[PDB]
Amino acid sequence: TNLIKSFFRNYYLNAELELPKDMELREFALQPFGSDTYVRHLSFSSSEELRDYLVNRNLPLHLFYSSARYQLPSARNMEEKAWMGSDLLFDIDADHLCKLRSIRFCPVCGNAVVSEKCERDNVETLEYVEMTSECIKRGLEQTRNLVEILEDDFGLKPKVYFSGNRGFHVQVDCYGNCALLDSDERKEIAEYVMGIGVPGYPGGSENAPGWVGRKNRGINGVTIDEQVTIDVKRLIRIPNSLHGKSGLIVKRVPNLDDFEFNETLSPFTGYTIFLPYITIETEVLGSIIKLNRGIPIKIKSSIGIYLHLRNLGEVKAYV
Amino acid sequence: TNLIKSFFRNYYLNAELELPKDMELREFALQPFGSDTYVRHLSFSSSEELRDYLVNRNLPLHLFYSSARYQLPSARNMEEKAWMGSDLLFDIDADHLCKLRSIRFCPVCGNAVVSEKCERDNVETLEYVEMTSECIKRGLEQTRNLVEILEDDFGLKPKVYFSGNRGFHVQVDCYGNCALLDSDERKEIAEYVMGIGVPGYPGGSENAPGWVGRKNRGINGVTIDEQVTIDVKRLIRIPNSLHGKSGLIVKRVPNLDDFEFNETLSPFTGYTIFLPYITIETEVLGSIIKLNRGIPIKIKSSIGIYLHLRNLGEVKAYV
Amino acid sequence: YSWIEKVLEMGLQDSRKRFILYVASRYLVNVKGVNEDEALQTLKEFYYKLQSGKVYESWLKSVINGVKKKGLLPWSLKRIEERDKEMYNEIIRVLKNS
Amino acid sequence: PPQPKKSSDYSWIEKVLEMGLQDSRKRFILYVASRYLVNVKGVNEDEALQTLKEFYYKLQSGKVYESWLKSVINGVKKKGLLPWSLKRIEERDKEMYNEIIRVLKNS
Amino acid sequence: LDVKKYPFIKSLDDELKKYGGGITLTDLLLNSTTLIDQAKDRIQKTKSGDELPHYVSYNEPVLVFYTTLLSLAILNDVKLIRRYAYAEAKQFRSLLHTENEENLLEISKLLDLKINRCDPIKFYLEKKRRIIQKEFCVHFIDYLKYTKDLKEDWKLSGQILHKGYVYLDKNQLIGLIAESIKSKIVEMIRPLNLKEIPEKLKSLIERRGIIPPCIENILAKEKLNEEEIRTLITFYIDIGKGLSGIVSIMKKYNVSNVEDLYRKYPLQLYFLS
Amino acid sequence: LDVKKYPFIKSLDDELKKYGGGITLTDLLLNSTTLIDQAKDRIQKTKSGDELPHYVSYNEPVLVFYTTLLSLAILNDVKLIRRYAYAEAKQFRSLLHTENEENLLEISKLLDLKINRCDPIKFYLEKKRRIIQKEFCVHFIDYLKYTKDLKEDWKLSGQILHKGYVYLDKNQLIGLIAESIKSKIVEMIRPLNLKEIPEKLKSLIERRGIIPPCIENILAKEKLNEEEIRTLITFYIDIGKGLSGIVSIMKKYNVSNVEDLYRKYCNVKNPLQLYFLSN
Ligand SMILES: Nc1ncnc2c1ncn2[C@@H]1O[C@H](COP(=O)(O)CP(=O)(O)OP(=O)(O)O)[C@@H](O)[C@H]1O
Ligand SMILES: Nc1ncnc2c1ncn2[C@@H]1O[C@H](COP(=O)(O)CP(=O)(O)OP(=O)(O)O)[C@@H](O)[C@H]1O
Ligand SMILES: Nc1ncnc2c1ncn2[C@@H]1O[C@H](COP(=O)(O)CP(=O)(O)OP(=O)(O)O)[C@@H](O)[C@H]1O
Ligand SMILES: Nc1ncnc2c1ncn2[C@@H]1O[C@H](COP(=O)(O)CP(=O)(O)OP(=O)(O)O)[C@@H](O)[C@H]1O
Ligand SMILES: [Mn+2]
Ligand SMILES: [Mn+2]
Ligand SMILES: [Mn+2]
Ligand SMILES: [Mn+2]
Ligand SMILES: [Zn+2]
Ligand SMILES: [Zn+2]
Structure with missing residues (x-):
């Protein structure tokens, strides 16, 4: 009996996911627990049909629905699927941005180990990457620029979401001919946002339109993941679903100044007895925390589930 | 699993499913063999049309029709379907009731394994849970009280069915304003049956009406699966269909005292040579059977097909 | 809300249910505030203006109950035009042709 | 040698569009009708949508999305795709072929 | 009863x-x-x-x-x-x-x-x-x-x-x-x-009261001017009139300014205590 | 304009x-x-x-x-x-x-x-x-x-x-x-x-020009001979006629040879001088 599993199953019992109105036209997909391969070609017509599947049939470690709309979302033949438009997506990953503290180690002896196995214990090595709130700050600056471009240059109404782990998703609901844009036409928008072929406007005014004012406000291109925007058939991590690498909620950011990166992003109440793998002092959900190897410690569920899914240790019981 | 198909295909050739009279208003759905995605939005107007589809186009591992009545059962959009009432459903699972014997193991090396995979053979672990007949007995007590509440307090005429695996389904045909009841109004009914907000009537008479007599007859709330009753729309497992986890018949229970949990619930005649995964002694359809790992064994088809779909081994041939 | 009463009084053809679902029912209950049974009989009276076809009373009660419980507001002719152009064009022509 | 031709007779497409079909309405829209209405007859981009929708709803059991038809039209326009030959239809999809031939016999 | x-x-x-x-x-x-x-x-x-x-x-x-x-x-x-x-x-x-x-x-x-x-x-x-x-x-x-x-x-x-x-x-x-x-x-x-x-x-x-003299200087020329338009509507907003019925009283005029005045979103003879 | x-x-x-x-x-x-x-x-x-x-x-x-x-x-x-x-x-x-x-x-x-x-x-x-x-x-x-x-x-x-x-x-x-x-x-x-x-x-x-006598020697006999066919078609490729519309011109004849000729792809050179005029 996986204990993280029960947490996830309990959240999905009552959680209300943000689902599109034409729900039956999307392909749903999920990565189950203890299986590295996705289940796809799922289709549901109501949030209740979906909730039954997640809670009784296949509990999701990661949950997605397609940015694209299909006539037959469950068909495996692509021409059967009948692609009929997709939403415009952007994904800002703090990969390129900050480069964080990372530690590879053996979960049995607790030593820093470069290799993929440990010689003594003959166990595979885990890696822990420390997600600081300064990283989320830099990420949050990027999506602020992106919302500026999409609103002022393109006239669109984007929605911002916490990715659940290391950044933000920007999604534009578009229902007209905007949804029918080529993958090629989306690469033109992607390169505009990234400032790839944008000329420097060396001596302009900050109030100039488009990239003229923006370049003279000191702003340059937005570091997005281009392949996310180019793929017409991308999988959107569902808002209010749980990110299987953190246990956090994919949360709408309705005001890009009120966003704080702390435990409130997790929906888990109570406390968990947590068993660390190493003696480490790191920042976890905006709070510096000291863990001691092999020394059980009672912490909140949010912090325990997070540290578990980040390979720092194991949640042993719930109170 | 190629041979299991032939058994099921043979049963559905002659079996007569209990189908509602307004058949053309129901959405039919089924899980085919070897496919994790449901086929749904089917509609049929006669038991013969359904028979052709099941035998020639898509053989069901699980077969359902919707508790809801629709104008367009085959429409994929929910509001296109035009819901015009749905039946009242209850589902009694003997999960919570009995607490059974369970074994997680690797089907290749045959060892007890805590994890979801096995180190040596690189295969995911299967789980076998032993379904005893005392378990079905406890389940039968719950539905007995449930029929009492529905008949004596609500004045309804419920039908009881063996779920085909681990419990019973109770279904009330109602066509007036009972069919149009909210999920909110259905949650009120669900909580009444479960005794959630029912006050203890500490010194009353056993012959008092409603929950006054019932609480003084020693009976408390019924352990149902509330989300099955709360959901306004649900898939009813068709009576006389085969449950793909056991091979048993979804069988009408016309008398709640005469129900015995044994091989008579399965329709499979003959014997099958069965190859167990582990050395185990368990109760199977009320009859204890002893299996030895990797040692083929000649047992009845009913017991073999059952043990197959319960992950204990593989049916290798039919006699 | 003069057009809703005008479309209800004359009738439609193709988008009668999308009009009942998103406009007519929500208007008769959540703006005009008529009796629950008066809206059902009116929506049946409205639907059977083209006279070819059938709609179930159980569905109309279902639509009435759902907009009553959720306080749904009828679609604006602005929303009708952007989102469902087939429905819009049927309404605008019944307004132009009288 | 000189440049060889191909064909020029597309009268049957107009006959199938005018009458209707039954089982293979979408495979006909995707591989024949759309490519013909835009890249052979060269009708308006929006008029083809209005014609293809009118054609599909002859048997009426089923539905086709306006968004899908615009998508198919844009895709055949950008790639200059030409409608399938009655021989190529015959090798690949006999279910569709026999449904078309019956509409051809029925006149 | x-x-x-x-x-x-x-x-x-x-x-x-x-x-x-x-x-x-x-x-x-x-x-x-x-x-x-x-x-x-x-x-x-x-x-x-x-x-x-x-x-x-x-x-x-x-x-x-x-x-x-x-x-x-x-x-x-x-x-x-x-x-x-x-x-x-x-x-x-x-x-x-x-x-x-x-x-x-x-x-x-x-x-x-x-x-x-x-x-x-x-x-x-x-x-x-x-x-x-x-x-x-x-x-x-x-x-x-x-x-x-x-x-x-x-x-x-x-x-x-x-x-x-x-x-x-x-x-x-x-x-x-x-x-x-x-x-x-x-x-x-x-x-x-x-x-x-x-x-x-x-x-x-x-x-309420009435509509003052300064307002009825407008219900006559049917073409007005520039500041005669920026203020003609900011009055109509204070009564509480809807967005639709405003453009219908002053016909034959610019709709480009209908936008710039929604973006805003004599007066003593109306708000009587 | x-x-x-x-x-x-x-x-x-x-x-x-x-x-x-x-x-x-x-x-x-x-x-x-x-x-x-x-x-x-x-x-x-x-x-x-x-x-x-x-x-x-x-x-x-x-x-x-x-x-x-x-x-x-x-x-x-x-x-x-x-x-x-x-x-x-x-x-x-x-x-x-x-x-x-x-x-x-x-x-x-x-x-x-x-x-x-x-x-x-x-x-x-x-x-x-x-x-x-x-x-x-x-x-x-x-x-x-x-x-x-x-x-x-x-x-x-x-x-x-x-x-x-x-x-x-x-x-x-x-x-x-x-x-x-x-x-x-x-x-x-x-x-x-x-x-x-x-x-x-x-x-x-x-x-273009015309088609010489030797070709109109063929649109008359409706059965022709053997070498009267190998040259009737190797000419027809040089006009530029398609593979489909060719078999329709000579009906009531062998289609088994229609295959072997797709694989090919008075006057002297009788037809090719009276057709491809340098004008
Ligand atoms: N396995 C997968 N396949 C396809 N798309 C995926 C995906 N996992 C995530 N996506 C989507 O593709 C974009 C980028 O994904 P990733 O950066 O790889 C994971 P994520 O959901 O963004 O969280 P993370 O980046 O904070 O770890 C996002 O819009 C996300 O919704
Ligand atoms: N795969 C599925 N998808 C949707 N509904 C399903 C389903 N399997 C079963 N149901 C329906 O959901 C309700 C409760 O089902 P469950 O308790 O999850 C399994 P079951 O069919 O009742 O058998 P079991 O409980 O004896 O194993 C019933 O109405 C059943 O028909
Ligand atoms: N109840 C409903 N709610 C919303 N859209 C519906 C609907 N029923 C049908 N539709 C829409 O109508 C189209 C197919 O149904 P139709 O045959 O046109 C029923 P209708 O136009 O609503 O009323 P009708 O009975 O007067 O024909 C599709 O575009 C579908 O989306
Ligand atoms: N959009 C599409 N384009 C091409 N082939 C399609 C298709 N949708 C389905 N098919 C193929 O056509 C067959 C039946 O699919 P269907 O869902 O019945 C569409 P259809 O028969 O072409 O049209 P219709 O049912 O709308 O009249 C299958 O072999 C499927 O692979
Ligand atoms: Mn990301
Ligand atoms: Mn059950
Ligand atoms: Mn219609
Ligand atoms: Mn078909
Ligand atoms: Zn080690
Ligand atoms: Zn093993």
């Missing part, structure tokens, strides 16, 4: 027949000065949380009620309609606690409450210390409807259901009628945003 | 109404001797890379235009059809650089270009040394369409977008019209592989 105590029994049309015909309430409301003022009295009493007088303390009881509904409809404040329908139902409660059974069953029959007398039900609790009797029964499908918006005390699991019927005493029959009335009042206000209202009768109920 | 300068405004049917009715272009092309000769002149001028005369240097410009499209359709050479629409748009470019604003916006309205006048946009660059003005705006979705096949000068990241609209000057409005015309011509040639062509009108535009 006293119409003077329960005005909502008789329809508005059946009351307008005492005064010839064709004369709707909009007409009769201009003659009488006391009616509109009495309706103002109730609204001001619900804003301050005071009891509401029973409608028998009025000379024209039916009319005072509808013009209180019509005043509430014109003010168009939903959060106030809630307080009123609450307070108004609270007032009607007392009148119910003085009524006989046949009258209580008559009111419920007129509110579409399917509540009846039936074979009573007695049972003892705590070894016959407590006794409980119920002589009214409702079908459980109707009962769930009538308790859609009610507290936990009305939850179905706390009731006594037998053979499909929930059993109530008289005090519970009353509590359902009182809630059925709190709903009929909100439902009776919606069909009063129907016809147009003579905008003096409106501004009488609204306690 | 001068039809003499821009023939593609009028449809071919709307011009054939000047001549009573029922009379299609096939009729007028046999009466008129000048039309076919003028259409070949343009093609020959684009084959060598020379300028094309404006259609104002023609007495009937509309007819010269379509028969230049119809002639190109008959040759069925896409690599040249591309060259023509290219060259033809260059000719139309210069004419646009002489047209007033009011005319430029009407042509674009007829080419389905959704470009309009808007509130102009001024901004200074390099500390007010450079000035830049733009008074035409197109929605960015349309702009991405209109620049589908265009070079990097039109790439979106090099443009000025505000509230969803790309802002252009007159030279850019013209360059888009010039590209819209390069497309309208290729789109106007496809629906000319539609009708059958009285194969003398076909062979007139092709400038």
Whole structure:
């Protein structure tokens, strides 16, 4: 009996996911627990049909629905699927941005180990990457620029979401001919946002339109993941679903100044007895925390589930 | 699993499913063999049309029709379907009731394994849970009280069915304003049956009406699966269909005292040579059977097909 | 809300249910505030203006109950035009042709 | 040698569009009708949508999305795709072929 | 059953027949000065949380009620309609606690409450210390409807259901009628945003003034100027007029400025204290 | 707006109404001797890379235009059809650089270009040394369409977008019209592989000769011989006839040899001298 599993199953019992109105036209997909391969070609017509599947049939470690709309979302033949438009997506990953503290180690002896196995214990090595709130700050600056471009240059109404782990998703609901844009036409928008072929406007005014004012406000291109925007058939991590690498909620950011990166992003109440793998002092959900190897410690569920899914240790019981 | 198909295909050739009279208003759905995605939005107007589809186009591992009545059962959009009432459903699972014997193991090396995979053979672990007949007995007590509440307090005429695996389904045909009841109004009914907000009537008479007599007859709330009753729309497992986890018949229970949990619930005649995964002694359809790992064994088809779909081994041939 | 009463009084053809679902029912209950049974009989009276076809009373009660419980507001002719152009064009022509 | 031709007779497409079909309405829209209405007859981009929708709803059991038809039209326009030959239809999809031939016999 | 105590029994049309015909309430409301003022009295009493007088303390009881509904409809404040329908139902409660059974069953029959007398039900609790009797029964499908918006005390699991019927005493029959009335009042206000209202009768109920000289300099030239347009609309916003009906009075003009004035979103002769 | 300068405004049917009715272009092309000769002149001028005369240097410009499209359709050479629409748009470019604003916006309205006048946009660059003005705006979705096949000068990241609209000057409005015309011509040639062509009108535009006696020795016996077939077909490949329409000409004969001849792909050389006249 996986204990993280029960947490996830309990959240999905009552959680209300943000689902599109034409729900039956999307392909749903999920990565189950203890299986590295996705289940796809799922289709549901109501949030209740979906909730039954997640809670009784296949509990999701990661949950997605397609940015694209299909006539037959469950068909495996692509021409059967009948692609009929997709939403415009952007994904800002703090990969390129900050480069964080990372530690590879053996979960049995607790030593820093470069290799993929440990010689003594003959166990595979885990890696822990420390997600600081300064990283989320830099990420949050990027999506602020992106919302500026999409609103002022393109006239669109984007929605911002916490990715659940290391950044933000920007999604534009578009229902007209905007949804029918080529993958090629989306690469033109992607390169505009990234400032790839944008000329420097060396001596302009900050109030100039488009990239003229923006370049003279000191702003340059937005570091997005281009392949996310180019793929017409991308999988959107569902808002209010749980990110299987953190246990956090994919949360709408309705005001890009009120966003704080702390435990409130997790929906888990109570406390968990947590068993660390190493003696480490790191920042976890905006709070510096000291863990001691092999020394059980009672912490909140949010912090325990997070540290578990980040390979720092194991949640042993719930109170 | 190629041979299991032939058994099921043979049963559905002659079996007569209990189908509602307004058949053309129901959405039919089924899980085919070897496919994790449901086929749904089917509609049929006669038991013969359904028979052709099941035998020639898509053989069901699980077969359902919707508790809801629709104008367009085959429409994929929910509001296109035009819901015009749905039946009242209850589902009694003997999960919570009995607490059974369970074994997680690797089907290749045959060892007890805590994890979801096995180190040596690189295969995911299967789980076998032993379904005893005392378990079905406890389940039968719950539905007995449930029929009492529905008949004596609500004045309804419920039908009881063996779920085909681990419990019973109770279904009330109602066509007036009972069919149009909210999920909110259905949650009120669900909580009444479960005794959630029912006050203890500490010194009353056993012959008092409603929950006054019932609480003084020693009976408390019924352990149902509330989300099955709360959901306004649900898939009813068709009576006389085969449950793909056991091979048993979804069988009408016309008398709640005469129900015995044994091989008579399965329709499979003959014997099958069965190859167990582990050395185990368990109760199977009320009859204890002893299996030895990797040692083929000649047992009845009913017991073999059952043990197959319960992950204990593989049916290798039919006699 | 003069057009809703005008479309209800004359009738439609193709988008009668999308009009009942998103406009007519929500208007008769959540703006005009008529009796629950008066809206059902009116929506049946409205639907059977083209006279070819059938709609179930159980569905109309279902639509009435759902907009009553959720306080749904009828679609604006602005929303009708952007989102469902087939429905819009049927309404605008019944307004132009009288 | 000189440049060889191909064909020029597309009268049957107009006959199938005018009458209707039954089982293979979408495979006909995707591989024949759309490519013909835009890249052979060269009708308006929006008029083809209005014609293809009118054609599909002859048997009426089923539905086709306006968004899908615009998508198919844009895709055949950008790639200059030409409608399938009655021989190529015959090798690949006999279910569709026999449904078309019956509409051809029925006149 | 006293119409003077329960005005909502008789329809508005059946009351307008005492005064010839064709004369709707909009007409009769201009003659009488006391009616509109009495309706103002109730609204001001619900804003301050005071009891509401029973409608028998009025000379024209039916009319005072509808013009209180019509005043509430014109003010168009939903959060106030809630307080009123609450307070108004609270007032009607007392009148119910003085009524006989046949009258209580008559009111419920007129509110579409399917509540009846039936074979009573007695049972003892705590070894016959407590006794409980119920002589009214409702079908459980109707009962769930009538308790859609009610507290936990009305939850179905706390009731006594037998053979499909929930059993109530008289005090519970009353509590359902009182809630059925709190709903009929909100439902009776919606069909009063129907016809147009003579905008003096409106501004009488609204306690307004007139439109000043500076405004009527504009209703003449039909072309105006530049600052004559930036201010012509910022006035119309302060009355509370909708976005649609503004462009219809000044026809033959620019819609590019209709945008720039929505983005904004003599005055002393209107906001009289 | 001068039809003499821009023939593609009028449809071919709307011009054939000047001549009573029922009379299609096939009729007028046999009466008129000048039309076919003028259409070949343009093609020959684009084959060598020379300028094309404006259609104002023609007495009937509309007819010269379509028969230049119809002639190109008959040759069925896409690599040249591309060259023509290219060259033809260059000719139309210069004419646009002489047209007033009011005319430029009407042509674009007829080419389905959704470009309009808007509130102009001024901004200074390099500390007010450079000035830049733009008074035409197109929605960015349309702009991405209109620049589908265009070079990097039109790439979106090099443009000025505000509230969803790309802002252009007159030279850019013209360059888009010039590209819209390069497309309208290729789109106007496809629906000319539609009708059958009285194969003398076909062979007139092709400038052919006749078919010699040895071939008409065959359209009579309806059974022929053996070597009378190997040469009857190896000739038919040299005309340029398709694989389908050939078996329909000689019916009631063997189709087993139709296969083995696809694999091939008085007078001396009897048919090939009387057909491919160097004229
Ligand atoms: N396995 C997967 N396949 C396809 N798309 C995926 C995906 N996992 C995530 N996506 C989507 O593709 C974009 C980028 O994904 P990733 O950066 O790889 C994971 P994520 O959901 O963004 O969280 P993370 O980046 O904080 O770890 C997002 O819009 C996300 O919704
Ligand atoms: N895969 C599925 N998808 C949707 N509904 C399903 C389903 N399998 C079963 N159901 C329905 O959901 C309700 C409860 O089902 P479950 O408790 O999850 C399994 P079951 O069919 O009742 O058998 P079991 O409980 O004896 O194993 C029933 O109404 C059943 O018909
Ligand atoms: N109840 C409903 N709600 C919303 N859309 C519906 C609907 N029923 C049908 N549609 C829409 O109508 C189309 C197919 O149904 P139709 O045959 O047109 C029913 P309709 O137009 O609503 O009323 P009708 O009975 O007058 O034909 C699709 O575009 C579908 O989306
Ligand atoms: N959009 C599409 N394009 C091409 N083939 C399609 C298709 N949708 C389905 N098919 C193929 O057509 C067969 C039946 O699919 P269907 O769902 O019945 C569409 P159809 O028969 O082409 O049209 P129709 O049912 O709308 O009249 C299958 O072999 C499927 O692979
Ligand atoms: Mn990401
Ligand atoms: Mn069950
Ligand atoms: Mn319709
Ligand atoms: Mn089909
Ligand atoms: Zn180690
Ligand atoms: Zn193993």
